[PDB]
Amino acid sequence: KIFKPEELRQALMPTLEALYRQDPESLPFRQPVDPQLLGIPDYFDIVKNPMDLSTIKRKLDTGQYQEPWQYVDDVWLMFNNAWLYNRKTSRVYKFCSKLAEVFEQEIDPVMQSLG
């Protein structure tokens, strides 16, 4: 099980695409949280390892995932950051849960075909 970077990218991209295509639910995740702009200075005290869809795309595009599970970990990291920081009935949390639902449905067959 060694992965050619461009094949790993071609296999995983559709799952990322499916997250981006969710409108409105992807919109808070399409770019990084900037706590200084938002005036939420407690954010990096709770979210130690920020992640968002733009960063995941960059990493997927520049060979930073050697194995499929590192991509999965980063998608879950984005979700878990939102779920820990935000109120359960908040738009961000509700939106996050939708992306998670989409990801769960998308990722499973893909991971089985990879290994």
Side-chain angles (χ1 to χ4, degrees), residues 11-35 37-66 68-80:
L12 294 177
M13 194 59 80
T15 69
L16 186 59
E17 284 176 343
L19 303 184
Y20 267 98
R21 304 288 164 98
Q22 302 311 305
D23 194 317
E25 295 92 348
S26 74
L27 299 171
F29 301 96
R30 284 180 180 185
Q31 60 290 309
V33 176
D34 191 320
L37 293 174
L38 278 161
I40 55 171
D42 62 348
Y43 183 78
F44 288 141
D45 295 332
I46 281 291
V47 169
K48 308 298 179 73
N49 302 115
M51 185 58 53
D52 76 293
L53 292 174
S54 77
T55 303
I56 292 169
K57 172 127 210 317
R58 178 178 334 281
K59 288 177 77 169
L60 191 58
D61 283 342
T62 63
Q64 286 182 61
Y65 303 120
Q66 306 290 304
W69 64 265
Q70 296 170 314
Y71 162 78
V72 171
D73 280 357
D74 267 352
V75 174
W76 281 98
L77 172 58
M78 178 178 80
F79 296 158
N80 278 131

